Write an enzyme that holds these catalytic residues in place. Structure first.
Site, mmCIF file in Angstrom:
data_model
loop_
_atom_site.group_PDB
_atom_site.id
_atom_site.type_symbol
_atom_site.label_atom_id
_atom_site.label_comp_id
_atom_site.label_asym_id
_atom_site.label_seq_id
_atom_site.Cartn_x
_atom_site.Cartn_y
_atom_site.Cartn_z
ATOM 1 N N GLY A 133 0.930 -1.308 -0.004
ATOM 2 C CA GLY A 133 0.146 0.204 -0.130
ATOM 3 C C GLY A 133 0.681 1.256 0.099
ATOM 4 O O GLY A 133 1.833 1.444 0.188
ATOM 5 N N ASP A 173 -4.520 7.659 16.620
ATOM 6 C CA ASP A 173 -5.183 7.045 15.353
ATOM 7 C C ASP A 173 -5.656 5.602 15.528
ATOM 8 O O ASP A 173 -5.258 4.962 14.775
ATOM 9 C CB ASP A 173 -4.055 6.992 14.073
ATOM 10 C CG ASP A 173 -4.514 7.110 12.791
ATOM 11 O OD1 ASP A 173 -5.808 7.207 12.531
ATOM 12 O OD2 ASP A 173 -3.913 6.818 11.806
HETATM 13 N N1 LIG Z 1 3.546 -5.313 10.434
HETATM 14 C C1 LIG Z 1 2.576 -5.394 9.366
HETATM 15 N N2 LIG Z 1 2.468 -6.900 8.897
HETATM 16 C C2 LIG Z 1 1.695 -6.963 7.837
HETATM 17 N N3 LIG Z 1 1.198 -6.141 7.121
HETATM 18 C C3 LIG Z 1 1.094 -4.757 7.560
HETATM 19 C C4 LIG Z 1 2.066 -4.557 8.605
HETATM 20 N N4 LIG Z 1 1.919 -3.103 8.778
HETATM 21 C C5 LIG Z 1 1.420 -2.760 7.853
HETATM 22 N N5 LIG Z 1 0.777 -3.612 7.053
HETATM 23 C C6 LIG Z 1 -0.081 -3.447 6.034
HETATM 24 O O1 LIG Z 1 0.693 -2.512 5.147
HETATM 25 C C7 LIG Z 1 -0.791 -2.342 4.101
HETATM 26 C C8 LIG Z 1 -0.551 -1.099 3.523
HETATM 27 O O2 LIG Z 1 -0.577 -0.045 4.611
HETATM 28 P P1 LIG Z 1 -0.883 1.679 3.999
HETATM 29 O O3 LIG Z 1 -2.282 1.846 3.569
HETATM 30 O O4 LIG Z 1 0.372 1.954 2.950
HETATM 31 O O5 LIG Z 1 -0.358 2.502 5.330
HETATM 32 P P2 LIG Z 1 -0.346 3.975 5.414
HETATM 33 O O6 LIG Z 1 -1.652 4.544 5.302
HETATM 34 O O7 LIG Z 1 0.294 4.192 6.826
HETATM 35 O O8 LIG Z 1 0.930 4.390 4.652
HETATM 36 C C9 LIG Z 1 -2.000 -2.615 5.053
HETATM 37 O O9 LIG Z 1 -2.780 -3.399 4.211
HETATM 38 C C10 LIG Z 1 -1.542 -3.242 6.216
HETATM 39 O O10 LIG Z 1 -2.386 -4.334 6.748
#
Ligand SMILES: Nc1ncnc2c1ncn2[C@@H]1O[C@H](COP(=O)(O)OP(=O)(O)O)[C@@H](O)[C@H]1O
Ligand SMILES: N#CCc1c[nH]c2ccc(Br)cc12
Length: 327
Positions: A44, A154
């Site tokens: 993401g 958050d």
């Molecule tokens: N420690 C983790 N283990 C597995 N998946 C994670 C972990 N931390 C974050 N994710 C995954 O990262 C994905 C992308 O997050 P993202 O939307 O980019 O976050 P942000 O808005 O903080 O930038 C999400 O689907 C989330 O479940």
């Protein structure tokens, strides 16, 4: 002007710790080896970072890499310091490493990987018992961070990861987290719209850990009542009206009167006059299986306008709603 406020718990934590604990600007970052990590797939992208699934080639274990976007350096050192301060705490995501990304030229935070259950599946299939069990697990994370002088700011379902097979929960995304210092005026532009506490919506800056308890109540109300989100505002102003349609306007005016807050005049034409609704108004045949008198009483004690009147995380853990959870 506004009347000051301070937390009713953990007020003194940061004054009794060494300055090194909360002075994140002075913290010297220890950098790891970027070549230890091979990016596998993008998971993401948000306003502040790109998130990747990766492999730590020194042990073949999965990790998650958050490559920070070019942003105020103060925000990055703050997240790192909070993650290091809370590392090893109950249900807190583990920061495994910090490396300089060779492409972005920015810090990349390396976290333990959670084989997380899909968000929709959690929302749709967690049982009454599972909601109690996992809420208790979130409270362990919140009491820990609050006891450590930090507010998350958050709390929302996408920031709570669950690996349902292993009954394992992790609170993630500490990029908006802040150290609580009594008397400090904070930015109200925190939390996601549906989980913003009334203190943020009325522009009251001297808030504290209790903001997280409001956000937790919004999460619980959505889960037990099967209404995603529970308070569905079209914007930050309508968000307060949505709250007032449930909690009533009289307690809202008592809250702003107590703290000598000047409500934005934009609210004069939209707030109307509403009475508090009894929680039973939201019960129906499709959510009855998740509702109990203890669930409603617990929710009632989180969702209060006055941030000083909400249960703390430790008081919440004492509530009858959790008596059925195996400890
Ligand atoms: N420690 C983790 N283990 C597995 N998946 C994670 C972990 N931390 C974050 N994710 C995954 O990262 C994905 C992308 O997050 P993202 O939307 O980019 O976050 P942000 O808005 O903080 O930038 C999400 O689907 C989330 O479940
Ligand atoms: N809402 C929703 C789904 C969801 C994601 N993470 C959670 C953690 C605890 C509880 Br209870 C529910 C969730």
């Amino acid at each position: 002007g506004p009347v000051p406020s301070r937390a009713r718990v953990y007020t003194d934590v940061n004054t009794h710790r060494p300055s090194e604990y909360w002075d994140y600007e002075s913290h010297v970052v220890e950098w790891g080896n970027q070549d230890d990590y091979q990016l596998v797939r993008k998971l993401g992208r948000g306003k502040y970072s790109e998130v990747f699934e990766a492999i730590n080639i020194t042990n073949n274990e999965k990790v998650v890499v958050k490559i920070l976007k070019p942003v105020a350096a103060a925000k990055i050192k703050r997240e790192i310091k909070i993650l290091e301060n809370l590392r090893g705490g109950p249900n807190i995501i583990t920061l495994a490493d910090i490396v300089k990304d060779p492409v972005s030229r920015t810090p990349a935070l390396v976290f333990e990987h959670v084989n997380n259950t899909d968000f929709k599946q959690l929302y749709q299939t967690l049982t009454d018992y599972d909601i109690r069990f996992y809420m208790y697990e979130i409270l362990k994370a919140l009491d820990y961070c609050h006891s450590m002088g930090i507010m998350h700011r958050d709390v929302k379902p996408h920031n709570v990861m669950i690996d349902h097979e292993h009954r394992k929960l992790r609170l993630i995304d500490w990029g908006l987290a802040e150290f609580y210092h009594p008397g400090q005026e904070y930015n109200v532009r925190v939390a996601s719209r549906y989980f913003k506490g009334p203190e943020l919506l009325v522009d009251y800056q001297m808030y504290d850990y209790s903001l997280d308890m409001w956000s937790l109540g919004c999460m619980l109300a959505s889960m037990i009542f099967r209404k995603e989100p529970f308070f569905h505002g079209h914007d930050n102003y309508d968000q307060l009206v949505r709250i007032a349609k449930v909690l009533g306007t009289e307690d809202l005016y008592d809250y702003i009167d107590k703290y000598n807050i000047e409500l934005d005049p934009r609210f004069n034409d939209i707030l109307g006059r509403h009475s508090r609704k009894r929680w039973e108004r939201f019960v129906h045949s499709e959510n009855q299986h998740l509702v109990s008198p203890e669930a409603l009483d617990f929710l009632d004690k989180l969702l209060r306008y006055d941030h000083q009147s909400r249960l703390t995380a430790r008081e919440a853990m004492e509530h009858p709603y959790f008596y059925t959870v195996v400890k």
